[PDB]
Structures are given as structure tokens and as C-alpha cells.
């Protein structure tokens, strides 16, 4: 599908509210496998199961290993911009 830019608002006591799978070491993108109900990703409205996360706050995640992506994603705070695509 089309590449999309999506804004997520997270408070400091919260996680993102997603599960991710995949990573470069497995030859697949960082993929959203779950959107947890009522948490920030669900509330933002624009992130969905099956979306590949291409970048977050301008940091490319296309070639990142799984744990690299976890570190990068969990570091982001507040108003967080995602670049995603559903394939």
C-alpha cells in the first residue's frame, strides 16, 4: 500500500501499545503484530496490525535487527512520528 506518516501521542508512564516481530536478521521488516486496546497506538488511530514500520522520528528501521528496533522504538517520547506501510 501507500507509505503513510502517522502521529502517536504517548504519556511518559506508557509504552507504545504494540507488539512487533521481524527484523533484518530474519530477512523481514519490523512488523506490527498486535495493537493493544486502549494504549497509545490504538488511540492514535493510524497504526494497524500488518503495518511495517519503516521509520520512527526520522530513524530508519528498514535494516534494523529486532532488538535494535526495540531499543530505538522504546526511546521515543511524547509526540512520535511513524512512517509505515501495509503490504
Amino acid at each position: 500500500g501507500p507509505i503513510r506518516k502517522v502521529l502517536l501521542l504517548k504519556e511518559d508512564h506508557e509504552g507504545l501499545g504494540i507488539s512487533i516481530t521481524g527484523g533484518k536478521e530474519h530477512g523481514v521488516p519490523i512488523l506490527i503484530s498486535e495493537i493493544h486496546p486502549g494504549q497509545p497506538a490504538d488511540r492514535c488511530g493510524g497504526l494497524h496490525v500488518g503495518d511495517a514500520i519503516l521509520a520512527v522520528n526520522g530513524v530508519n528501521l528498514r535494516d534494523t535487527k529486532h532488538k535494535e528496533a526495540v531499543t530505538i522504538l522504546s526511546q521515543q517520547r511524547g509526540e512520535i512520528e511513524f512512517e509505515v506501510v501495509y503490504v
Binding site: 509504552g15 512487533i20 516481530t21 521481524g22 503484530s33 493493544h36 532488538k67 522504546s74
Partner: peptide
């Protein structure tokens, strides 16, 4: 999951 999954 086919590959590892992390909740974040």
C-alpha cells in the same frame, strides 16, 4: 510467532 515478538 514465526519470529521473535516483543511487546513495547
Amino acid at each position: 510467532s514465526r519470529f521473535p515478538t516483543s511487546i513495547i
